[PDB]
Design a protein around this nucleic acid. Sequence first.
RNA 1: CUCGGAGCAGAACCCAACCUCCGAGCAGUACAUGCUAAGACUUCACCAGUCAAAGCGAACUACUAUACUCAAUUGAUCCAAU
Lengths: 147, 54, 291, 95, 56
Amino acid sequence: EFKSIYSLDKLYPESQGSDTAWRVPNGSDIPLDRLTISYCRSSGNKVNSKAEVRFHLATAEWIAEPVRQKIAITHKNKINRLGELILTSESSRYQFRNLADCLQKIRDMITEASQTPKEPTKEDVKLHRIRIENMNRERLRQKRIHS
Amino acid sequence: VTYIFHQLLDMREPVFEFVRPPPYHPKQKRFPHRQPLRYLDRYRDSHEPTYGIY
Amino acid sequence: QGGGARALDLLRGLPRVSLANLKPNPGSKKPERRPRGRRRGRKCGRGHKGERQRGTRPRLGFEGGQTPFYIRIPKYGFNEGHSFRRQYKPLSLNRLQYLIDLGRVDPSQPIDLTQLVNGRGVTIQPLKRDYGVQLVEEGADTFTAKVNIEVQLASELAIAAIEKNGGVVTTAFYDPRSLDIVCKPVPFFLRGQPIPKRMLPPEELVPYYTDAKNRGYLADPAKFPEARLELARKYGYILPDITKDELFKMLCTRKDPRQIFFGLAPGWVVNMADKKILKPTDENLLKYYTS
Amino acid sequence: LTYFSARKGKRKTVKAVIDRFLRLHCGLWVRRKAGYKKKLWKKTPARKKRLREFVFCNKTQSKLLDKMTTSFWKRRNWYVDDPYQKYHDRTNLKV
Amino acid sequence: KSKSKNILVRMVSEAGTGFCFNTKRNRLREKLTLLHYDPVVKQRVLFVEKKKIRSL
RNA sequence: CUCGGAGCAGAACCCAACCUCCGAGCAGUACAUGCUAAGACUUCACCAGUCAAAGCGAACUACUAUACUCAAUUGAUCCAAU
Ligand SMILES: [K+]
Ligand SMILES: [K+]
Ligand SMILES: [K+]
Ligand SMILES: [Mg+2]
Ligand SMILES: [Mg+2]
Ligand SMILES: [Mg+2]
Ligand SMILES: [Mg+2]
Ligand SMILES: [Mg+2]
């Protein structure tokens, strides 16, 4: 076997061994087994594909219980009747990237819930109109003449 | 309202979205004289690189 | 079957095919036009006077004196340095899977440029500043083959597709001379020159090939396990343990950074006529070829 | 144009063209606008933005530039990280 | 040609970004200090005249 | 000898003469006359020129505020200075 001065053994003497680069580190945040991953075609025909990841939020034990309860409130609009949190990404042609996007959303949800950020976010324009409309609804509220 | 659908009416809750008409573009021509380079992007379905036969 | 059999039994009853009864296929011999006769003579299609008929109209691009279109546009470096830009022939996973399914590339052995070229999978032009093949992600969803493949560039998604199926992908640099040799070895062996050493990447490319994220051939092997695990996590698949595979030894086979061909060392002379290999023993020569 | 060179008997490229125009493999030619670096102090923002655009040539100009350049300049190139890579191929073009 | 009234000057940002813009001013007035939008810092900052480009 | 307005050319566009008249080769105010982008106009080609929704960022709940007033108020490529 040919070995030159630029052999990986000579370049990286501490990293010698035929198995050095191929070992799987033993020491796992999102368990793929616990997720139901489906693939379909988004409007296809539209070029981009679609990947859907759904799991039962309450049963999931890989998410902390307090985190589970705060995600249910924040993302109540993504939880169906059966209690499964449904995420979907259709931004790519490749199922891999669509699944990677869905998995990153799960990681972002858990991060946001644990962060408990108290920073005051800038009010969206649609929310501003609702604030005025809610204020006037409270202003019409009355009290019983004889309580 | 979710409670009414899920519990009282025993059904899945219908969600709706306001969808706008797709944007108009004139028929694409082979030589778009004096149009900017981004003219071609107006008629592109995907943003990811394509390689054809290769 | 009204074609082959009807066209040959009908020939039995026709005169012998000879040099006296041949003709070109209709439409293959457009008539030639000559300036003779009323229709095509007289002014012969050249018009009347002017530069036109006399054959002295100005050069192409000249506009009669108005500052021409191709000059009045400002210069801009669209093509500046075009001849020094590195190029990489794309090889998609669809094409790679197609070649494997048809037996044109053998996944049981290491796949490099030589095997890709020998299977007529890709055409490389070193004289046109091609620096090798770039593995592109197209077809990743349906790519199933397990391969040990050596390319010059690879996309992150293409790497993930290779390693989800249990394969190994490495990015390897070839200088222009080395690339010509590795692509067409037989023409090189007929020159009677010692196998040259593969040059190192240019300084601007050293970061790429010393990074485990790109599976660079000069990267620290100890950093590959982490890089391989990151892609498995990002794209939602379980990194297979290739150490347990029966083809693990083959999957690990890699060229030395100075080696053009597997099993052949720099400074060896291939004698194809006698099917022998000549190895130099001079200490100075051995030092040159091993450094 | 030199249709047949004295040394090789081959067509030559007009290099003035190469210095000013980008040829996309689909046949289109891209150029800058004349005067886009001239007297900006007297030109309005809208006009200056128009002058910064990279624009396409028409059929006649494209035919002319094709004649003034040899085949080498029409080959498909695979430059690494080419900014114009996406524009080399047409999409959804009818007729 | 002979007539001469205004001049073109280069206004340089005081934010240290190096962003500059050209403006027209009267030749007989004092050097300009203006509040102008600087894209590098993405907010309006003070600009001070440095050099005369040409006579307008 | 280039540019604009009017008549000839009465009503979509276009329209000549060593035809008939009057002008232009700036000035003033801003200093977001910032960025970006659908769709269009076009002096009969090209070059050049013109108008713009939405969006970002501003301004803003007094400002016929959002592509400044203004008819023309102007000069390609190379090259030079930086
Ligand atoms: K004739
Ligand atoms: K005739
Ligand atoms: K150029
Ligand atoms: Mg005659
Ligand atoms: Mg005659
Ligand atoms: Mg004549
Ligand atoms: Mg026109
Ligand atoms: Mg707007």
